Structures are given as structure tokens and as C-alpha cells.
Design a protein around this ligand. Structure first.
Ligand SMILES: [Cl-]
Ligand SMILES: [Cl-]
Ligand SMILES: [Cl-]
Ligand SMILES: [Cl-]
Ligand SMILES: [Cl-]
Ligand SMILES: [Cl-]
Ligand SMILES: [Cl-]
Ligand code: NA
Length: 129
């Protein structure tokens, strides 16, 4: 599924991400824009053979099981395929674990490089939320 901007903001708020660990909804929308372009089915292979999955490009090195990332963990206790669903529940639940891990949203390199410190409220501007 390719979400619209305000459609994703609304879904992230319905699943309790807005202001989660102090990160406003615009931070989450911005992260999803640059990680996946709002596409739930986005995948990207990393140089180390891990894969990033879904709207927030969650990595198999730590967070999900894809059977093909040697030495990896599955700390969200999910198949990485669950992160590609039209329903964002598994991505949101796992993202809450990641952003609790100690470095906040810096875990998302694209958030650090393209969202951190910017006018992230622009991402929810105009949205009926
Ligand atoms: Cl957009
Ligand atoms: Cl915001
Ligand atoms: Cl594996
Ligand atoms: Cl594990
Ligand atoms: Cl699995
Ligand atoms: Cl959803
Ligand atoms: Cl933080
Ligand atoms: Na894994």
C-alpha cells in the first residue's frame, strides 16, 4: 500500500505513535517519507546482507526474522514479511521498541539526516487528525 501523507499521519495516530517517546507525529511521517516514500512494501538490501522492510525500513539485523541474516536477532518477534502489510500495526509496534532502545529516532539514519531539526510539523500540516 502507498499511503498519502495525511492518511499515514492518521494511521500512525490511531496506533499510538503520535508523541511516542516524545516524537511528534510529523517526525514519524517525515521518517516514513524518506525511508519508504510511504510504501508498505518497500525493501532494501544492506551491504552486510541484512534487509530493511516496510514503511519505516526496519532492519533484519536486530528486529525481525527473514531467515537470511546470519547472527541476527528478532527483537520484535515477527517475520519481516509482517512489516510489509497494508495494516501498519506490526511496523508501529516494532518502531515503538526501536525508538525505546536508547538513541531515539537516530536509529533511522534517514530521520537523522533529513528530518531531525527540520520543520517536521509541515508533514501533518492541513491534516484532519
Ligand atoms: Cl508527500
Ligand atoms: Cl509534528
Ligand atoms: Cl536469519
Ligand atoms: Cl531474538
Ligand atoms: Cl519468522
Ligand atoms: Cl493501518
Ligand atoms: Cl529521545
Ligand atoms: Na533477524
Amino acid at each position: 500500500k502507498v499511503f498519502g501523507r495525511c492518511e499515514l499521519a492518521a494511521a500512525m495516530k490511531r496506533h499510538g505513535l503520535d508523541n511516542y517517546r516524545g516524537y511528534s507525529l510529523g517526525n514519524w511521517v517525515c521518517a516514513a517519507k524518506f525511508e519508504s516514500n510511504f510504501n508498505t512494501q518497500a525493501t532494501n538490501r544492506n551491504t552486510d546482507g541484512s534487509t530493511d522492510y516496510g514503511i519505516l525500513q526496519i532492519n533484519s539485523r536486530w528486529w525481525c526474522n527473514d531467515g537470511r541474516t546470519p547472527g541476527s536477532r528478532n527483537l520484535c518477534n515477527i517475520p519481516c514479511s509482517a512489516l510489509l502489510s497494508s495494516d501498519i500495526t506490526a511496523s508501529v509496534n516494532c518502531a515503538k521498541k526501536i525508538v525505546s532502545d536508547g538513541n531515539g529516532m537516530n536509529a533511522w539514519v534517514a530521520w537523522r539526516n533529513r528530518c531531525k531539526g527540520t520543520d517536521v510539523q509541515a508533514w501533518i500540516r492541513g491534516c484532519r487528525l
